[PDB]
Amino acid sequence: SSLHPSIPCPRGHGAQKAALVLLSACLVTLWGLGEPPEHTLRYLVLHLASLQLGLLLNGVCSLAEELRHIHSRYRGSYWRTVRACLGCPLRRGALLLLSIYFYYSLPPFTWMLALLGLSQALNILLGLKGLAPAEISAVCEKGNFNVAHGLAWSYYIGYLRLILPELQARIRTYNQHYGAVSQRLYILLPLDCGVPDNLSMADPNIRFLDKLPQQTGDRAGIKDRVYSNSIYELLENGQRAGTCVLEYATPLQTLFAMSQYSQAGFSREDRLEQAKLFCRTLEDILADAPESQNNCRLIAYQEPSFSLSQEVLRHLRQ
Amino acid sequence: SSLHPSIPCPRGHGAQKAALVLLSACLVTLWGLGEPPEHTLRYLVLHLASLQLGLLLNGVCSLAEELRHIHSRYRGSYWRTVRACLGCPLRRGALLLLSIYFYYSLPPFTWMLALLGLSQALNILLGLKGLAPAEISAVCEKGNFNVAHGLAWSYYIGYLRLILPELQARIRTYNQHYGAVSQRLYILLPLDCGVPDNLSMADPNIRFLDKLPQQTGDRAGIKDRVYSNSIYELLENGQRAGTCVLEYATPLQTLFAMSQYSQAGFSREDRLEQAKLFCRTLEDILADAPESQNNCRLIAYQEPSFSLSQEVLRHLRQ
Amino acid sequence: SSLHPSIPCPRGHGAQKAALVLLSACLVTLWGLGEPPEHTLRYLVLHLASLQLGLLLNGVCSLAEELRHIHSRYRGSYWRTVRACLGCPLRRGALLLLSIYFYYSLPPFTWMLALLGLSQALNILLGLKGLAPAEISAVCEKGNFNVAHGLAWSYYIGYLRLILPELQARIRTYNQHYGAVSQRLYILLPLDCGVPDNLSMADPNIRFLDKLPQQTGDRAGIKDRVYSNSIYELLENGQRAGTCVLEYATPLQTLFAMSQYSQAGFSREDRLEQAKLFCRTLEDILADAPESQNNCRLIAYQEPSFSLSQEVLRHLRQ
Amino acid sequence: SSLHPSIPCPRGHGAQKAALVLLSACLVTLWGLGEPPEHTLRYLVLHLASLQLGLLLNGVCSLAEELRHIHSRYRGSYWRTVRACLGCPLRRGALLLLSIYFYYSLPPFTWMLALLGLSQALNILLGLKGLAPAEISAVCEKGNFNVAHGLAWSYYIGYLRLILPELQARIRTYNQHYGAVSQRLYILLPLDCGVPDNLSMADPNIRFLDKLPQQTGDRAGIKDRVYSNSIYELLENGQRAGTCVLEYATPLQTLFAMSQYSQAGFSREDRLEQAKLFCRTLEDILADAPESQNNCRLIAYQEPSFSLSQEVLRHLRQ
Ligand SMILES: Nc1nc(=O)c2ncn([C@@H]3O[C@@H]4COP(=O)(O)O[C@H]5[C@@H](O)[C@H](n6cnc7c(N)ncnc76)O[C@@H]5COP(=O)(O)O[C@@H]3[C@@H]4O)c2[nH]1
Ligand SMILES: Nc1nc(=O)c2ncn([C@@H]3O[C@@H]4COP(=O)(O)O[C@H]5[C@@H](O)[C@H](n6cnc7c(N)ncnc76)O[C@@H]5COP(=O)(O)O[C@@H]3[C@@H]4O)c2[nH]1
Numbered sequence A, B, C, D: 001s002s003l004h005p006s007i008p009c010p011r012g013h014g015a016q017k018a019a020l021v022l023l024s025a026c027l028v029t030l031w032g033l034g035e036p037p038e039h040t041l042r043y044l045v046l047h048l049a050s051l052q053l054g055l056l057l058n059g060v061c062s063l064a065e066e067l068r069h070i071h072s073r074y075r076g077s078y079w080r081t082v083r084a085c086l087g088c089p090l091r092r093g094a095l096l097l098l099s100i101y102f103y104y105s106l107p108p109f110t111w112m113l114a115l116l117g118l119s120q121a122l123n124i125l126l127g128l129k130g131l132a133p134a135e136i137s138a139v140c141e142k143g144n145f146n147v148a149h150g151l152a153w154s155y156y157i158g159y160l161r162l163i164l165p166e167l168q169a170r171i172r173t174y175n176q177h178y179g180a181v182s183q184r185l186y187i188l189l190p191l192d193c194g195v196p197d198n199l200s201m202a203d204p205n206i207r208f209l210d211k212l213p214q215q216t217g218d219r220a221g222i223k224d225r226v227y228s229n230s231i232y233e234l235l236e237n238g239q240r241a242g243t244c245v246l247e248y249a250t251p252l253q254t255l256f257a258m259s260q261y262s263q264a265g266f267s268r269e270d271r272l273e274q275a276k277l278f279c280r281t282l283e284d285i286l287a288d289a290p291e292s293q294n295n296c297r298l299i300a301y302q303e304p305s306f307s308l309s310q311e312v313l314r315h316l317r318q
């Protein structure tokens, strides 16, 4: 990571390595105990069969609910619903038949089935199937089930992809028709999502200069939609030090407000996590984005004293 | 849902009813088999103990990974990381002690622990911890782990919350200076996420008439950010039939773009699901929003034959 | 499929269904034979262990070669090379340890290892590991290891994506400055890849009318790269019937020529298969392409008599 | 490879040498264990028979799917489909008869057949037939199942084969009418697939000077298709140092675009590999091409610092 140390890096395969260590330790233990190795395989297969049967029971329980959404979620198809509730039906059926064959045959199946169903019903009714926070976060980042992902892609697709290509032209026009504004757009990324509408209320040194010429385009059925970029003066010890096109990242305002509305179901820990995820995703997008031909810089900072103007000037004087 | 029948309703408790029926059936089956309830209780407790030990081992394996993000994601606290990997540690410890006690007491513990660890390691290494699509969708909707949620809240907070209060004044100003446009902002919600940049290209009857009295204000370091809302005339049979403010929902354009980009990890089925989720979320927000004092009207439509102008005129007349 | 009946449809899951049927039949057979079920599991696990060991041996054999390409293919990393030769090392190691534990323990490991290595060496030296044509084709279509995929994406990205958006404008300009040319671009897709440079040499009825105004753009460091679309007159019984912008698909010329150069290693059966795959992929691309707002039609035909002008007029008169 | 060291050389026979060493080691081990060669031969033949039966069963399972494409992909011939699913049927039948004979004869066949079918069905249903990345890459390179192959052959056939013969005449015409440009077409092969639409944006020294005497001809129904090749001056230290015809390879732009689109199923590692494969294939083609009579020069470069103009001037001077 390079934006800010607080930004987490993508998760690796540490869990699989721990699993391999656990497997080795368990095999060594079973070897030490000196137990009939055929029993080990027998009972492991029985345990996996129990897991498969429990998955089947929970899947039918969830199907009881998902069938009410068949015509809206699954195109009125029962096969798609069954697949959503039990994975691939062919593999699940194959493993179910293997379980049945290797339980009835290896040294009652109906009693075991009743017990597994009782356990599954107890877990479902009491809500014991809740995923751990780490598992939920891993599932969300893996499949990009996050608001920050969509916000970053909206910021790139809706604003940056349509502004950065025509940013140098407007800057050169302003320079011709008027100071030495830095030839880039600097985006502030407050991880606290404290985005004021005025940069002068954050740091007095950051003062408002003139503005770039408006950019107009037809967007989503709105004729001549306006995009305006403001130019700000950076004051050091009361004297101007540098000029640049500065602006906060607006989606952080949405992240902050969502933590203020109870209807959003968005907590403050979620706010921080999604802000950092937004920063990471935006950096990843800009890395491979062809529009960003050195036309944008991301400035992520955290408030513990702190001077925003100093960070901007550090990123400018490099 | 009144927008479109294709919008799926929120999930209920069908899984709970199915679990209750399964519980009753399993109790009946155990009664029929004639075995005494004491053995059933013993083996049920043993199965739950095995589940608890498996959870412990999986949490240890996942902690082996989450400890790498202790400082960035967990604020340098080992308690928080362990909690994320094992839920509330106190409850987990209590249940583990219960499991150990009711194993050593109920007719070798270490061997079963090794077997369970072997099974968990096999599940982790072979990627058998996968959660079914229905489970993942339910976990996301309950926790609002979706891009559509953030996009809808950004659209409401970013644009509607600032435009709807001042829309009546702008429309009245436009009328006094010329115009019998309607007193609502009509929003198009294509479930296919088409969103062309010009309405007339989707339906020739939709023809641009004139703009509105531009609204401007400060927004996240941008001075005089301009908000534009255009007016379109609704042609019908070659002559005018209605006029109002009409514009697409840009977050759907963002969703469509995300499906085109591979860096987003966003599919087209996910695109449709997230578009419908966005529509439902925006519907739910405007219902309880103080700003939507009858000042907006959401229009959702799936392209089969059909005419956008006809849909808008139907929503106007009706 | 709709382009042409000869175009294959994507492969389904028939192999998995046949596998499930085979599994059921084998389980029924084993049950009928009345054999100790523990032996079945024992020998199945032994067979899978043998397969894992054979995979390990073949993987090290292939690593012996892939290590020579470590600095060019795998970024000078040995871990990446090992992963490319043996899949995920963690899972492979786990299954190897399971094999070792459940072979030495279930009723010589070194003799079996030597025999498996001998078999693997015999297969490698004699070239017995060759994949069947169906398996190769499935692997290629699954991962898009095909020339036709790249050719279709080049045709869309390089030509259509930069022509179709500005096609109606040029057609309207020609109509103003001059007949009733159809308002679309019609692309011929001869599955035999017999693409002549002159449409009049194929069918005399297809005659050359004037041409659309040139389209110019800077492409790949070439200033004002020219794109020219020709207009052709469709003669029926000696009299004009319709006008349209017609052109063959050029990548078919490359497909044909590649079958003429031995240096290409491209056969005629490969030519036909890749031509049909190109047609399918182009249709799939245009289906979801936003540029194709009814601006292009694909005309795939096969020569058994046949009149190209008749097919063009059939697609025009619809 | 002289283009760039990062271009991997074609694979050799290292796997064969490794297999030979493994064979020798296994023979030595079997000699050491002291078992007679007769048992070794028996069990080796049994193992090969098991492999043959597994191939038979997998081919039956895959035929259950390929029979759906008998008419579209196999020309309505069952023999061709069976051959694609089982290689040459005669050899497969001979080997199966040998297996049956040497099983019934060498100290229950149907039980082992059922076990092998169970194993094959498990492998198919669980998706265990996956081929390692090295194996897939070798199969693709041997069979030229790559997009880069088709792109390179299209670039040579489509553009170079038509431009190189007439490039000298055009350059001479340009010189007589004005100019000391070089007598070769220089092609840039960025392994990162950047390919900006204007050279000066990648290096300010690369400045457009003038075009050439446009070449035109008929191409796949396009009358007077125009081929343009621009001239760029190579600045060095503020004054001219060299002039020649310079243009990027557009197939690399196609590769980059394919990686941006999700519908392509094209990754970025695959992008780099296919770019290097394209460069190698184009190098191999021009070596034996009658058209490349010293009329072209390929320049490959990976962006580390480095200057494109410096690379071009180095290739010119040297
Ligand atoms: N600093 C800045 N100046 C701009 O001109 C601008 N325009 C867009 N954006 C930001 O890029 C992202 C993409 O916007 P998108 O249109 O896809 O969703 C937008 C869009 O659907 C709607 N909306 C906002 N402003 C307008 C507007 N002027 N006209 C029409 N719709 C608007 O409400 C959504 C949220 O906007 P913001 O959450 O305040 O910041 C946006 C957004 O984060 C801008 N950011
Ligand atoms: N009918 C038609 N008229 C055109 O103007 C045209 N321009 C491009 N194409 C086709 O689209 C596809 C994309 O071309 P790409 O540039 O990515 O690769 C091209 C490009 O790298 C190079 N090339 C061909 N023509 C030119 C040209 N005029 N200028 C520079 N490079 C060219 O050689 C490749 C193969 O071209 P064609 O294989 O004959 O047909 C192309 C191609 O199939 C055209 N097709």
Ligand SMILES: COc1cc(C(=O)O)ccc1NCc1ccc(C2(C(C)(C)C)OCC(C)(C)CO2)cc1
Binding pocket: A045, A046, A048, A049, A052, A087, A091, A092, A095, A096, A098, A099, A100, A102, B126, B128, C041, C044, D122, D126
């Ligand atoms: C990716 O493949 C898998 C997918 C899934 C899934 O879809 O959930 C689960 C497990 C998968 N592979 C591991 C595995 C498969 C099968 C068995 C087996 C034997 C065939 C050992 C005889 O043991 C008993 C059994 C009833 C569990 C099934 O058969 C053991 C282990």
Ligand SMILES: COc1cc(C(=O)O)ccc1NCc1ccc(C2(C(C)(C)C)OCC(C)(C)CO2)cc1
Binding pocket: A041, A044, B122, B126, B127, C045, C048, C049, C050, C052, C087, C091, C092, C095, C098, C099, C102, D126, D128
């Ligand atoms: C995705 O899961 C798989 C991946 C791969 C692969 O990477 O090739 C192969 C197989 C995978 N699942 C199936 C599977 C079956 C059986 C076994 C097992 C028992 C766990 C029975 C005890 O028996 C046979 C063994 C000793 C060899 C290993 O252990 C394990 C797994």
